[PDB]
């Protein structure tokens, strides 16, 4: 009943009854499966997760230069040297500066200068290698148990959660009161992770060509040195300036964040809702209703009158949802339901929520059914006090 209220909702039914059925699941898609003498089920892919990522490299897109140290020597006094030179968190460069009487040297000539600055990364991106077989899929199987709160209930645990990998596709899922459904899936990702790197940038991700990722002119750390200090190629974002042989100055090159996004236009993007990855690709699955059974069926019809406890609402697909409460006696009971013409001659329109039953009298039942076009009569219960409700469907 979880699918009710979703636009991209697919109504799938089996051929030759419905023993087996093929369904395609995607992020945003929702599938309602129907099979004869089998309970109607709602399937929805809710999560996709790369489970054993290997960081290849980590790139610095935003760099900060702090703890600047400078040392200079007079002409004929040797090359200056700082202990920050041996320190790998620092970036150093030597140069020559004009020295004289006026700046503190007994003799005129070129004097050695050395500037060092601590390279601290502000923002970075990561390049993770994902094994295709290690993509975990979370699917919710919510049956059409008329249940008072079932209808579009996202959080309240009405459905069974099951995890699939391209590796392990076949799964048996137990639905309490219905039995077991078997799922043989097959992922249709659209783009494989073969010689692809998953380039993650804070809240955005891309699928990029390996050699392209390994060729970016940015400071980097290896997969072997995560939480490391020694950034390779600091020079790609740090530049030294000495154009008048007076003073050496260190300069950064500014955030490459935006610059990157531009290069990543001709790259497959991957989105993120609530911090998790939403893969564009599909997922074809084969179902088996063989060990599935309708809850009850061995029950007797409802002797008493029914009460419409909530106004009939039409879904975006033309189907209608009706919340009815039992005021009679017999529960656990079986709801008599029929959609007919204006003279009760022919039984028109199908029932989506197959085999509607009452468990507790106090608990209302949500019945979903596809009414026919034009004028129809929704009939809930048996004589006397049969709920007759006229329906409009252009």
């Amino acid at each position, epitope marked *: 009943m979880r699918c009710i209220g979703i636009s991209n909702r697919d109504f799938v039914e089996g051929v030759s009854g419905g023993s087996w059925v093929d369904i395609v699941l995607e992020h945003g898609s929702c599938v309602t499966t129907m099979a004869k003498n089998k309970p109607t089920l709602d399937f929805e892919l809710i999560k996709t997760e790369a489970k054993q990522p290997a960081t290849l490299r980590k790139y610095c897109i935003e760099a900060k230069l702090t703890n600047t140290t*400078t*040392e200079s020597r007079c002409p004929t006094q040797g090359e200056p040297s700082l202990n920050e030179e041996q320190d790998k968190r620092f970036i150093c460069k030597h140069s020559m500066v004009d*020295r004289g009487w006026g*700046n*503190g040297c007994g003799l005129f000539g070129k004097g050695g200068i050395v500037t060092c600055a601590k390279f601290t990364c502000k923002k970075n991106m990561e390049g993770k290698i994902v094994q295709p077989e290690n993509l975990e899929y979370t699917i919710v199987i919510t049956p059409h148990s008329g249940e008072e709160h079932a209808v579009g209930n996202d959080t309240g645990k009405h459905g069974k959660e099951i995890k699939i990998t391209p590796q392990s596709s076949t799964t048996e899922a137990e639905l309490t009161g219905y039995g077991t459904v078997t799922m043989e899936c097959s992922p249709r990702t659209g783009l494989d992770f073969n010689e692809m790197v998953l380039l993650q940038m804070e809240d955005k991700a891309w699928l990029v060509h390996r050699q392209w990722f390994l060729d970016l002119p940015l400071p980097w750390l290896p997969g072997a040195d995560t939480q490391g200090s020694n950034w390779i190629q600091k020079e790609t974002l740090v530049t030294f300036k000495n154009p008048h042989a007076k003073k050496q100055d260190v300069v950064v090159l500014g955030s490459q964040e935006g610059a990157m996004h531009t290069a990543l236009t001709g790259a497959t993007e991957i989105q993120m809702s609530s911090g998790n990855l939403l893969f564009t690709g599909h997922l074809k699955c084969r179902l088996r209703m063989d060990k599935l059974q309708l809850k009850g069926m061995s029950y007797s019809m409802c002797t008493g009158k029914f009460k419409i406890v909530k106004e009939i609402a039409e879904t975006q697909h033309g189907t209608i949802v009706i919340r009815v409460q039992y005021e009679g006696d017999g529960s656990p009971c079986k709801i008599p339901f029929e959609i007919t013409d204006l003279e009760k001659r022919h039984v028109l329109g199908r029932l989506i929520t197959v085999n509607p039953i009452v468990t507790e009298k106090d608990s209302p039942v949500n019945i979903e059914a596809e009414p026919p076009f034009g004028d129809s009569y929704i009939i809930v219960g048996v004589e006397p006090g049969q709920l007759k409700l006229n329906w409009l469907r252009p």
Partner: antibody
Amino acid sequence: VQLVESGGGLVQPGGSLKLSCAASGFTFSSHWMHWVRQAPGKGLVWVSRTNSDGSSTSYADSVKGRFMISRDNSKNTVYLHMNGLRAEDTAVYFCARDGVRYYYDSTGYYPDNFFQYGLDVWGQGTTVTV
Amino acid sequence: LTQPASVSGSPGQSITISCTGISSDVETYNLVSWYEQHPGKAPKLIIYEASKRPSGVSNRFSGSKSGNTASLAISGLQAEDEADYYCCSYAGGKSLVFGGGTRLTV
């Protein structure tokens, strides 16, 4: 030739305080400026130094990491940033001008080892209690 | 940098204040600095570059340099010289250190 000082007062341990030292009567941009501590009833302790632009800076091992020096030649002022101030850092902070280096380096930029210095002009100081 | 605790001397008498602190480099002692500070008041540069004396500072104030020691001489004590004297030098090429402090008692 003045060296005015401001920023002192009540400070709780492990807290932030910025000390400003104003200047007039000399080419401030061209002089190395210094920070020197002195307990209520004890001896002088050299804290920090800055060259003309602030490229060469030095700090006492006692303050290294928790302290930071800075200056802007526009306002003709020198600053001392003190973060995570421990109780043992209680004293009267002084800002001094290294006037002797100017007789040698008319630029006050070049960070040489053991260059001739001499803290010429001193400020009245400012007391901090932590 | 170790300076004697206190040096006492009669008016007219000539005294000397020592300054020695571990450092094994001629770069240090040849660059010793001396400061005259009265209680509560701000310090004053009396000697720079071990022997050099700035204008204003009295002739009586002298500056000596030893191999691993520094000395401040007050040739002819006067009542006005009763103050605190602090020596100063290079810890490292880019670092300064003050001495223990000598209390001059006339």
